[PDB]
Amino acid sequence: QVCDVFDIYAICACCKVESEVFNNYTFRGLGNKGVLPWKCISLDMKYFRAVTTYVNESKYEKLKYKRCKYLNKKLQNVVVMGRTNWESIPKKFKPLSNRINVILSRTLKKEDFDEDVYIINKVEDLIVLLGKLNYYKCFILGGSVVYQEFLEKKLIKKIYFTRINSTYECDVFFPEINENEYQIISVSDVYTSNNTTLDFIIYKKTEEDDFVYFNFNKKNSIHPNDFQIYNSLKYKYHPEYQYLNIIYDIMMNGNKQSDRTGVGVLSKFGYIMKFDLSQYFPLLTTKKLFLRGIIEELLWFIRGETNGNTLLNKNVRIWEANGTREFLDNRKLFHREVNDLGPIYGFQWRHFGAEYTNMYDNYENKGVDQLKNIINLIKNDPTSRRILLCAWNVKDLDQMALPPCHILCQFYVFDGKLSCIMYQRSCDLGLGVPFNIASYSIFTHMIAQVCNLQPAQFIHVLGNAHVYNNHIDSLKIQLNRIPYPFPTLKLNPDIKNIEDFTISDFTIQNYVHHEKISMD
Amino acid sequence: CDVFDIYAICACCKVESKNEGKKNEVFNNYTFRGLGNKGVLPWKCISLDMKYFRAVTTYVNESKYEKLKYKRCKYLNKNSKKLQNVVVMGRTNWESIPKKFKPLSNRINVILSRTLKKEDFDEDVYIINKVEDLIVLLGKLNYYKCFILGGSVVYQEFLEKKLIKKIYFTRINSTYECDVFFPEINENEYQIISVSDVYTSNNTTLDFIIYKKTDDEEEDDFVYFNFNKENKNSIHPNDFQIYNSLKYKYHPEYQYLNIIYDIMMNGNKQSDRTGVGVLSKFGYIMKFDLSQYFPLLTTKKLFLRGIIEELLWFIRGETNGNTLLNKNVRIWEANGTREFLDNRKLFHREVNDLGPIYGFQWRHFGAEYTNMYDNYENKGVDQLKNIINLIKNDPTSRRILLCAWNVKDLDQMALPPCHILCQFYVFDGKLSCIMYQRSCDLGLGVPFNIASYSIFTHMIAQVCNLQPAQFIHVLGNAHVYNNHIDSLKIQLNRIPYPFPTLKLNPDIKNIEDFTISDFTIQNYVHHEKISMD
Ligand SMILES: NC(=O)C1=CN([C@@H]2O[C@H](COP(=O)(O)OP(=O)(O)OC[C@H]3O[C@@H](n4cnc5c(N)ncnc54)[C@H](OP(=O)(O)O)[C@@H]3O)[C@@H](O)[C@H]2O)C=CC1
Ligand SMILES: NC(=O)C1=CN([C@@H]2O[C@H](COP(=O)(O)OP(=O)(O)OC[C@H]3O[C@@H](n4cnc5c(N)ncnc54)[C@H](OP(=O)(O)O)[C@@H]3O)[C@@H](O)[C@H]2O)C=CC1
Ligand SMILES: Nc1nc(N)c(-c2cccc(Cl)c2)c(CCCOc2cccc(OCC(=O)O)c2)n1
Ligand SMILES: Nc1nc(N)c(-c2cccc(Cl)c2)c(CCCOc2cccc(OCC(=O)O)c2)n1
Ligand SMILES: O=c1ccn([C@H]2C[C@H](O)[C@@H](COP(=O)(O)O)O2)c(=O)[nH]1
Numbered sequence A: 001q002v003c004d005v006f007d008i009y010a011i012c013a014c015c016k017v018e019s020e021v022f023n024n025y026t027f028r029g030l031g032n033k034g035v036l037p038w039k040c041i042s043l044d045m046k047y048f049r050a051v052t053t054y055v056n057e058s059k060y061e062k063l064k065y066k067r068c069k070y071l072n073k074k075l076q077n078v079v080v081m082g083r084t085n086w087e088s089i090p091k092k093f094k095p096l097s098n099r100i101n102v103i104l105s106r107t108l109k110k111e112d113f114d115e116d117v118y119i120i121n122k123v124e125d126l127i128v129l130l131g132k133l134n135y136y137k138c139f140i141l142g143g144s145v146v147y148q149e150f151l152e153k154k155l156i157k158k159i160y161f162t163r164i165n166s167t168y169e170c171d172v173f174f175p176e177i178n179e180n181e182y183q184i185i186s187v188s189d190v191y192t193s194n195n196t197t198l199d200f201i202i203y204k205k206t207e208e209d210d211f212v213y214f215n216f217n218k219k220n221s222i223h224p225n226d227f228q229i230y231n232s233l234k235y236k237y238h239p240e241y242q243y244l245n246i247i248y249d250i251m252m253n254g255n256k257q258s259d260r261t262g263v264g265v266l267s268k269f270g271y272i273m274k275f276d277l278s279q280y281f282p283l284l285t286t287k288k289l290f291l292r293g294i295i296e297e298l299l300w301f302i303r304g305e306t307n308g309n310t311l312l313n314k315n316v317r318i319w320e321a322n323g324t325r326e327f328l329d330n331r332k333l334f335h336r337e338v339n340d341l342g343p344i345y346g347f348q349w350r351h352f353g354a355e356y357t358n359m360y361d362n363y364e365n366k367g368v369d370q371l372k373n374i375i376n377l378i379k380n381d382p383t384s385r386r387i388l389l390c391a392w393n394v395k396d397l398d399q400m401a402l403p404p405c406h407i408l409c410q411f412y413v414f415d416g417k418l419s420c421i422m423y424q425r426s427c428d429l430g431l432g433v434p435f436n437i438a439s440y441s442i443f444t445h446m447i448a449q450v451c452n453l454q455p456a457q458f459i460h461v462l463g464n465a466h467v468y469n470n471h472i473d474s475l476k477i478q479l480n481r482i483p484y485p486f487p488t489l490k491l492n493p494d495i496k497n498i499e500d501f502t503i504s505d506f507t508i509q510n511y512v513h514h515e516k517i518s519m520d
Numbered sequence B: 001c002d003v004f005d006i007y008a009i010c011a012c013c014k015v016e017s018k019n020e021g022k023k024n025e026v027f028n029n030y031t032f033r034g035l036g037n038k039g040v041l042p043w044k045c046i047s048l049d050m051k052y053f054r055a056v057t058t059y060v061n062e063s064k065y066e067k068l069k070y071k072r073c074k075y076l077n078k079n080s081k082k083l084q085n086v087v088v089m090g091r092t093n094w095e096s097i098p099k100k101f102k103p104l105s106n107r108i109n110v111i112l113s114r115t116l117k118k119e120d121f122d123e124d125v126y127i128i129n130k131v132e133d134l135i136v137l138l139g140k141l142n143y144y145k146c147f148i149l150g151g152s153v154v155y156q157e158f159l160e161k162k163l164i165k166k167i168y169f170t171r172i173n174s175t176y177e178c179d180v181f182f183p184e185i186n187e188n189e190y191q192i193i194s195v196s197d198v199y200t201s202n203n204t205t206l207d208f209i210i211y212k213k214t215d216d217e218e219e220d221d222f223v224y225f226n227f228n229k230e231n232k233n234s235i236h237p238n239d240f241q242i243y244n245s246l247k248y249k250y251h252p253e254y255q256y257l258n259i260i261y262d263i264m265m266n267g268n269k270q271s272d273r274t275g276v277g278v279l280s281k282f283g284y285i286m287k288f289d290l291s292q293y294f295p296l297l298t299t300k301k302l303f304l305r306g307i308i309e310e311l312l313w314f315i316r317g318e319t320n321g322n323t324l325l326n327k328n329v330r331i332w333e334a335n336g337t338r339e340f341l342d343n344r345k346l347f348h349r350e351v352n353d354l355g356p357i358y359g360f361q362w363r364h365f366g367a368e369y370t371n372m373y374d375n376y377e378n379k380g381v382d383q384l385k386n387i388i389n390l391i392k393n394d395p396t397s398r399r400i401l402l403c404a405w406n407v408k409d410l411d412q413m414a415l416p417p418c419h420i421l422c423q424f425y426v427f428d429g430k431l432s433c434i435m436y437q438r439s440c441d442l443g444l445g446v447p448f449n450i451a452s453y454s455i456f457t458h459m460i461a462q463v464c465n466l467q468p469a470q471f472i473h474v475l476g477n478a479h480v481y482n483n484h485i486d487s488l489k490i491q492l493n494r495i496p497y498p499f500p501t502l503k504l505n506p507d508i509k510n511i512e513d514f515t516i517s518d519f520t521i522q523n524y525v526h527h528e529k530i531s532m533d
């Protein structure tokens, strides 16, 4: 194949388009009025320059042989542009440096250009030219017209595709990719550049003995084909893979166990995930999540409330099952009013060590206001190793509707940035953990803002990590979905106190996600 | 040796050192030198070393033979197809081996001997009269690699004649009566380039080390995904010469050493409470397989009497610093002084009255602290009893947690606990433990802290009739003191030894019944003590 001999690749950047169901075609905006739809995304420019300029000397002779054999016979890449594309580039950036420049045109000829460029009036002439040049790889840089004809002709080996996770006015579009001709093989980390998130995906046309020696000493009824898309990917660098890889590990290596609930689980013990909150908001994209409930739940914690009715009256049902007459009696809380959850999170955060009475009592200035103390440590003693918020009050556990899953939060401050570790004793990977990542990520943003810091890392440590048997088929589906670039979280910047946030102070922007799943 | 790919593969134990150890035994690579006793192995059977042996000496890569055959002809200036390795044995060596294991299967069996000739054996089973008759035989043979399986004599003469390219060296971490020894490997002639995981087989730990004579479409994609990647801290390269010269660092001590390297290379410069300055990072996990070893650091010397007394003192629920000081355990001495308590605003606290720390929270969480002499019997929550009962009676509970971080009591403690909580996990008769540590002194504290919680995991497992599985150590604020940097540079350039084992008195069946005499560290092989400051 011509694309394999001549190593012809496409590289593009696509945004979302002004016009909700999401698919790969969501990212299709290329240009507007003969220029880019966006002002400048410097990180995509950096990636573009590195990919289109990189060559490997030592690998060239193998390519020279391949092309010689097919034809019967500093190193640079070739870059090919449409005439309209060429005319969009600033004079100061043209011809593209350290690359062989090729322009496709009928209306213009070599006499129309001052620059060191090749003009070709036919695609077939590109193939003849590549045959005559010494070069590493050939990158098609666009036009929409140019992409459309090179894909149509099956002359593209791989598409290096930037997903720009923001919406702009566009008048030219990247062609809809055919899933039977091209499949994603690699997905990068998520980044922020110029107030947008983005990632980089790759579509593909559809001493060593000592290592084996040290391997001389190498469970569950999971089938290979069950994870075909998941295991087809070469580079899984998107941070959502920290979640998906743990699910995979428990399904393949997990220990079959009963639990408190009767469903039985697969379980393992001890994991860590790390999310860079400076670069993205880690709301899972491989299924739909809504945050209104978990934001109302965090605001209720911060107020120190234990009254379940406060959440039910906001149509948030997260704690409804744990406040029922039946549930409280099964906990031996016979003298507890329905939806009186006892001295759970909010109470421990604002009043640790106070005697719990009922959900209506005024606990002002009783027990330890841990939340206030950690905000004061972050502001006045930021190098403190003692900046911890702890919900696990051993004395009060049997008075709680249930003992907390999120044991503690520890904070770390360096160079004006705030990082948070949350330790979770018990982690429902299918249902709970996706919400728990979002909760503590929002909380990190809130604590950073009220202490005049920038959020850095949310670090999630999982103790007993389990998949419920009734979630296994739903997670097999989810694991074969390719994550989308993450959204971003914005807070009202006028909020200066932890107690002053309300639901309208939080916006999730650019959330692109796969379809809702019922885990059950 | 680089033409005919000649390697030595051996297994060496420790040797009864002649009733005489100087004061404290000094250890080096030579510690492991025992080969044989009265024509047999010094040990009964170590089945994991037998399996490694079989696997190393039989493994062949057909698709790499062209480079080897080419080099052999080219250099020498010059059928069945099933490529095999050569294995060379001394006569004594050959005659130790049982019949049904001779000849060695899937391998070309050679035998250095003055007093045998081929017509007693075959052409399958080559004999050679002198060393040079091997290079001759190799010249005329299709083979992958040549493995010298020794005899003390065979190894001695092969090494002195510089014919060995690499040594596959099993360190058997136990002492046996031996009459023949492996020769002292000159560290100027050979260096270790790889170290395995530590294993238990047949009631000994062992590891495997290697001495050395002193679709690429997807390869460019790796470079593209690295397009945004980074003397950050004033630490040089040649500082970690030996550390960075190893190819495979699978020994579990590297989970500690790699964190020190990460903090030295990438850590944040910060002031602290202590006034000294640290490099710090946030969030690490180490995991130690207590079924296979006891992870007592071997790249310096550690003592355990103090940390075992401390754990027994926790289990009794004591807060009385004098109990430890009267045993010359000084871990808490500085935290109990008049000056230290007065700086904590504990003006009304008696010297060495540490307040409601670990012991008190493990046995009496929620009780009102009075003083270190009061009777707290049946006061507050006995967490230690509750977790033992949960492990025995409800082992799949996800609520098996022991927590020292009592928010109410923090300001009454001489200092808030570094070791926030232990969480337990039970599966298939085996006990694993996660300990979360808010504040981790990588140079001084963390080596002790790994030993403490590893011992505790064994204690809890034994009193619940379980086998210990993993100790999982979660580090929060993980820091290297600026005054440890030189010492840890020294330490990172030491190669770990196979780990010791911990033995508990098997009679102890209740967590309260352990005493100092119930704990034995066996086969502790360690590098020289380092003063961290
Ligand atoms: N986001 C991204 O990655 C990219 C965005 N862009 C944007 O795309 C827009 C420009 O694209 P679009 O308008 O399609 O224009 P194109 O850059 O695809 O250029 C079209 C022109 O190139 C010539 N051409 C194409 N094919 C041939 C052929 N087979 N033989 C001879 N000449 C050929 C013709 O020039 P003539 O008329 O002279 O004959 C044709 O009119 C701009 O908004 C630009 O900013 C461009 C590239 C990448
Ligand atoms: N721990 C380990 O890894 C290993 C341990 N062992 C143990 O070691 C002991 C065997 O070793 P050790 O006693 O040295 O005996 P060896 O197996 O080294 O036997 C030495 C004999 O091999 C022949 N030989 C050696 N060099 C030459 C030469 N240059 N030219 C001709 N013949 C030569 C001679 O036999 P001849 O009499 O025929 O002249 C010599 O006496 C046993 O206890 C065995 O179990 C053995 C292998 C490995
Ligand atoms: N992933 C991806 N694929 C694409 N094909 C295009 C792209 C878009 C329009 C035109 C061109 Cl040539 C390329 C872009 C947008 C980034 C364009 O960056 C450029 C283009 C040309 C010159 C240039 O020089 C200055 C510099 O290198 O800093 C930078 N992104
Ligand atoms: N790393 C290492 N190096 C060494 N050189 C020796 C060794 C020790 C004594 C004799 C011999 Cl041949 C080898 C050992 C001890 C393992 C013994 O391996 C054997 C010895 C004899 C027969 C045999 O076949 C049976 C089997 O396949 O298990 C395996 N370990
Ligand atoms: O924020 C939460 C709350 C609960 N759980 C899950 C973990 C367990 O499946 C269950 C709690 O039950 P126990 O672990 O307490 O038995 O709920 C979470 O994942 N996250």
Ligand SMILES: O=c1ccn([C@H]2C[C@H](O)[C@@H](COP(=O)(O)O)O2)c(=O)[nH]1
Pocket: A385, A386, B273, B415, B416, B418, B419, B439, B440, B441, B442, B444, B445, B446, B449
């Ligand atoms: O068992 C212990 C006790 C202390 N430390 C270290 C951590 C810190 O360097 C210091 C405790 O001081 P703060 O982190 O509380 O400031 O002692 C440990 O590593 N392990």
